[PDB]
Design a protein around this ligand. Structure first.
Ligand SMILES: Cc1cc2nc3c(=O)[nH]c(=O)nc-3n(C[C@H](O)[C@H](O)[C@H](O)COP(=O)(O)O)c2cc1C
Ligand SMILES: Cc1cc2nc3c(=O)[nH]c(=O)nc-3n(C[C@H](O)[C@H](O)[C@H](O)COP(=O)(O)O)c2cc1C
Ligand SMILES: COCOc1cc2ccccc2cc1CCc1c(C(=O)O)[nH]c(=O)[nH]c1=O
Ligand SMILES: COCOc1cc2ccccc2cc1CCc1c(C(=O)O)[nH]c(=O)[nH]c1=O
Lengths: 313, 313
């Protein structure tokens, strides 16, 4: 009985990894995720220049999840490139590097310089499409013409297999359109579903106040609020993108939640809010939990049930 | 202390009502909501002809909420009109009628016939914009040119004050666009935020199966999953539509949840999932709990705190 996977020409002890933005910003964080029993890690989404991000408080969590408007704080691309090229021990586990440029030009600039390190060291690019572009325009992946533009330029500029991080969608015609766009690009070998549920608003009854400072309290939602939405996106893309891998992300607190993601079609399973809250010991719990479920059901490997969610008659 | 209010030229004992679709489809349902402690009721969204709806199972509920793909089962427009015209006791509470035609032409033919009963009896129109139009393309409220057409044609055909039931949005540019469309229509006097969170997927770990039969298990989410999304939509529209009222719908299980919707800006508060699960006794509990939070805070009226959610710095 085993959780091992091999994909994108890499071998993974198990399917768990942090979600981008959680426990991945500093060298300390990245060493910690490397020391964990995660099967991989992803570095904090970066921009060309380092960023302080938004004023605090900018993340808060609660029993059913989290809200954030961090504002892409990060050490800058040069830092994460260096971590990939000189500091990361790939004998431990593979490394994804998330990039989240604020324009298509910024992303092109970073991927041209990532390419030789990716070729040589085997670092895997996760391009964040759930990302602002022009203010007053929708985020990139809710603007299908900008999304096409971004994947065209990055495919050209990078020339290597990469993956994309997607916002949730809530309409079947949007699933149909978004997957068609992704399927235009052979180099997009994996699709991570999902980024947070956009522009939620948490209000504290006692103080009569929003809980985060930026954007009048509006921010992205993660955690238990978003699991069914995350499962639907994973399955929607799994069913529409047969030639690509789908990584699952949203509401994983338990091996049973990871189990559902994998039945929906997930290959890797990312952990954001639950990992922020519980810390990296979560990965041993999740592995034990999923293995216990597999044993009860008589499944010996992930491929025996990946994508095998049943529908009704 | 009593929670009485007046709006749209009608008097309400309190700000609670059922959400459209819940406990509102048959004459029995409607009479049951009328006998409840609710401030108002809305009928099931209707089409010109009666509809059986989608295959069962089509609704399921769980600790954190519900998923449904009911498929607009209803007794048809002639039935709801006759309930509004001959059967409802307006001395008991106001009545809203929800219209959800599958084309713009369907909605115009229904509102033309509704207008004289509205004039004569005071029944209030809630137009459902979270409704498909054409297969292959997005639901109406996610296609702003089609939304504008529906509002233009309906305002012309109906010619009296009405309201709109909106899907959640998740992107600020989309709030800006949707609210500017609605503000083009002086007759749209209320906006109900929000309809269910579209196309989630619930999977049962034991059976490895989705839980509703239609659409391969995909359906709208309500309940606790959706409260911060509903609060964000209530507030976003409240800030953008100073000349309209905003009705809150989504994730109300408690008087505290109703408190948060009103702080966000809600005038009326609709109850779907919680009502489906608890039954119409819920309205007494909600009233008592809201009154209790008001007492503890020293609020004497809803108006003292409606829309008064505090931001940080
Ligand atoms: C504090 C915080 C920071 C995040 N930063 C990023 C980021 O930089 N890039 C990114 O793609 N997603 C980011 N996310 C999104 C998560 O990676 C994830 O998609 C979302 O939280 C849903 O997963 P969850 O339900 O496990 O939290 C962030 C989430 C949180 C809570
Ligand atoms: C079983 C079911 C049937 C529904 N039918 C309708 C409908 O006919 N029209 C409508 O505008 N919304 C309909 N809804 C949406 C609710 O009115 C409401 O917007 C949604 O459930 C979110 O509220 P809640 O969190 O309190 O459930 C329905 C919801 C449920 C659960
Ligand atoms: C459009 O989705 C929100 O994500 C962002 C919001 C930003 C707001 C101001 C400046 C930069 C922003 C960057 C992002 C993308 C980074 C990101 C963040 C974040 O850094 O705020 N939080 C998430 O939940 N997901 C993300 O993908
Ligand atoms: C736009 O998707 C949610 O609403 C509907 C979905 C339907 C699917 C197939 C056929 C008709 C549909 C009609 C609607 C509108 C009625 C409705 C329903 C419903 O009757 O399925 N459920 C909701 O949660 N909200 C609604 O507004």
């Amino acid at each position: 009985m085993c959780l091992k996977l091999n994909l994108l020409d890499h071998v993974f002890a198990n399917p768990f990894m942090n979600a981008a933005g959680v426990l991945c910003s500093t060298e300390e964080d990245l060493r910690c995720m490397t020391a964990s029993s995660s099967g991989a890690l992803v570095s904090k989404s970066c921009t060309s220049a380092p960023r302080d991000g938004n004023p605090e408080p900018r993340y808060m969590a609660f029993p059913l999840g989290s809200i954030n408007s961090m504002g892409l704080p990060n050490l800058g691309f040069d830092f994460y490139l260096k971590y990939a090229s000189d500091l990361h021990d790939y004998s431990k586990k593979p490394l994804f590097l998330s990039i989240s440029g604020l324009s298509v030009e910024e992303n092109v600039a970073m991927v041209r310089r990532l390419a030789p390190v990716a070729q040589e060291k085997g670092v895997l690019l996760e391009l964040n499409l759930s990302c602002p572009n022009v203010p007053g325009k929708p985020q990139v992946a809710y603007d299908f013409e900008a999304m096409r533009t971004y994947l065209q330029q990055v495919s050209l500029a990078y020339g290597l297999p990469f993956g994309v991080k997607m916002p949730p969608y809530f309409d079947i015609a949007h699933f149909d359109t978004a997957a068609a766009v992704l399927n235009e690009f052979p180099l997009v070998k994996f699709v991570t579903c999902v980024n947070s549920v956009g522009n939620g608003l948490v209000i504290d009854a006692e103080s009569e106040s929003v809980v985060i400072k930026p954007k009048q309290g509006f921010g992205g939602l993660g955690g238990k609020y978003i699991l069914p939405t995350a499962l639907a996106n994973v399955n929607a893309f799994y069913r529409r993108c047969p030639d690509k891998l789908v990584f699952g992300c949203g509401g994983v607190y338990s091996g049973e939640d990871a189990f559902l993601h994998i039945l929906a079609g997930a290959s890797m399973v990312q952990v954001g809010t639950a990992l922020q809250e519980e810390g990296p010991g979560i990965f041993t719990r999740l592995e034990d939990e999923l293995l216990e479920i597999m044993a009860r059901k008589g499944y010996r490997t992930l491929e025996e049930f990946r994508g095998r969610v049943k529908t009704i008659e």
